[PDB]
Amino acid sequence: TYSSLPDDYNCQVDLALTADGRTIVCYHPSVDIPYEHTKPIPQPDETHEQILKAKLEVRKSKQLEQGPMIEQLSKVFYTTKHRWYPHGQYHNRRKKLNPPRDR
Amino acid sequence: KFTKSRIPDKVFQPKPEDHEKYGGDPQNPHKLHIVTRIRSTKRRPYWEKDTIKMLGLQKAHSPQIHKNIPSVNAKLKVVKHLIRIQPLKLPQGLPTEETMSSTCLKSTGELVVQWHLKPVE
Amino acid sequence: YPQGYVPKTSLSSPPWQEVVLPDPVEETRHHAEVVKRVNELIATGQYGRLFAVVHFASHQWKVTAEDLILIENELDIKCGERIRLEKVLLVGADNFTLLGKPLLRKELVRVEATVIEKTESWPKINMKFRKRKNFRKKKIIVNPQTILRINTIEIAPRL
Amino acid sequence: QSGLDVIRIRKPFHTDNPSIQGQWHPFTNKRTALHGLRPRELR
Amino acid sequence: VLVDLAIYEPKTFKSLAALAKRRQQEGFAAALGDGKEPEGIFSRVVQYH
Amino acid sequence: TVVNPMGLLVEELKKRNISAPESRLTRQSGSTTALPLYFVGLYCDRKLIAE
Amino acid sequence: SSFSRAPQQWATFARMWYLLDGKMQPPGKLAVIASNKLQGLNKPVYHQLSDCGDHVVIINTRHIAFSGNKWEQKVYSSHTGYPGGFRQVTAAQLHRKDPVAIVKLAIYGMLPKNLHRRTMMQRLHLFPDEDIPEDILKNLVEELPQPRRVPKRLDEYTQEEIEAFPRVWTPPDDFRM
RNA sequence: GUAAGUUUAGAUUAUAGCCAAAAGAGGGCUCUUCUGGAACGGAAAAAACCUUUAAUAGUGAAUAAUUAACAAC
Ligand SMILES: [Mg+2]
Ligand SMILES: [Mg+2]
Known part of the structure; x- marks a missing residue:
């Protein structure tokens, strides 16, 4: 219990100095979540599409217009309406076809 | 009129507590000064600008070795406020021809004649 | 009630809580035991990928085997020639890490790299702002570059 | 040189194994709760 | 480099936090110690020459 | 490319004479939203094998 | 570690739901905490271009507290845009009309003055009292410590605690009291 | 302590300053004398105050100045 940080969340910390005093050794094994700290999976009722569809239920006038649709989308994702509007063709043609990819 | 200033001599007479x-030690005074420029001569009068170049302190935070003799001290008193004066100290003695290439000036003001870059052990 | 006793109040005690450090004697015994355990892990080879923090050129690089580093200057090494990185500040594994003060000993860590490419940077435009700026008062800076592939990070039981 | 195009390079360092101990996610450094009870949950 | 360890080596970064807090506590004790107390285990400086 | 990774896992643990894993909900965030995060840990003999 | 590409990315940039209790709390201290989580400044992966903010739920905003005489001295000003449309309201008056307004306005000023501030305010959920919609409760991940430790009232103090504190002075027998 | 100076040969441009701080004289201006300044940092925006020896490439580091300050027997 020499560590100054609790060992119960991320990892156990053991700090030690080598006898010479020129190295600092840290032993940090990970902590596993105890079984008693977990919940059973809710087996009774799933693809993320199904969850999306229920949130964006088509109720009024069959397909909604841009205005009503955008307000429905904004509430579901906690965004503003402005994000969902399109852009003109100057901006669309500026977008790179093949952006660089890192790993 | 802004003019060159003459400091009363009492300023440079130290006290026992000092x-x-x-x-x-008031006896066996140190021989060489370590002087570094720590302020700019911009916005300072031209006479202060002149001495800083005479003393070699054009670059800031780069130490210059100077003689602890009255004539040099007179110039240093002109720019006392723009510099830090530190006594040069020789724990292991003056560098010789053999050790001239192995010296190092520490921040403490001590010129060591053997610099190894190894743990003291 | 002892002399200089103050009843508990809002300002009687400092906001912070004083902590009691373990006595040095017991800690040193535990310190040696901790070091011994880690040394066995190194000795028995109970580790996977290693990552090291290395001081090369003027910069520090978090490094792991198969990694690529770009150095913004010429190095004087032929392409394909293997090198040892000698200033390691940290070597780490899944379960342990070793910290230098400030540098780890050569006995512990050996980091090897290879020169893969010697190149130049793309043209960088250096144009200052001046009266009558003009379009031709322009400088192009191209700097030699070196690319190093980290090959191995190895540790030995010499704690 | 290699034939790779001489253009701006975004990062001076490339690695396919950036992490050994696990990449940080918001639950790392969060302690679990008995029975996995979320705050204000009665049980 | 400290950012790279925080994002990609969380277990190592926790060790650094414990080491930093460990040294910080020693400094608090040292100031109250007045110099009579011996120096902390992690507060020792490796000299070079 | 392996489909039904749970079925494979079950077979492997049987070969090791290990008990069938029990799935449980370790960490949970924003379940009722459209962007939920779930951590599920497979527990064998009340011991965590994978999350 | 050892996750597939997409699940790892999803976990790292997932957004968390935090709970703040505002009872007997200064709005500014609540604002500092909330403004930190809303921006995502609590994450090592924070970037201004990453939209890594979190959801903050603040309850009991009706029961916030001000130091000093800020209830009567702090004034909120608005203009409708028409001649004569300038309004100045004290903190108490604004609190009476809307219990939630004071907390929202303190947080609004603390967020960066850019377009993303409007998006961040969508993630802020302010409830005047302890009651929360069931769905918001289920999202919650963690509660945050109250920034201000609330002093105890006399009645709250236990009988044992009272005895622990010394009786500094003694009233004389011949006193009305 | 330091590296400039004098002389010979040739040559234009310039010959309306601005602001800050000192000392005067006319009486806030208006003059004369002496010092400093012309950020890419700071003082909110900020020619003139303060920090700043030139010019560079780097996903390094130590720093400078740094608009804030804590009612009565
Ligand atoms: Mg010009
Ligand atoms: Mg400031």
């Missing part, structure tokens, strides 16, 4: 505070 020797204890700075740890310098």
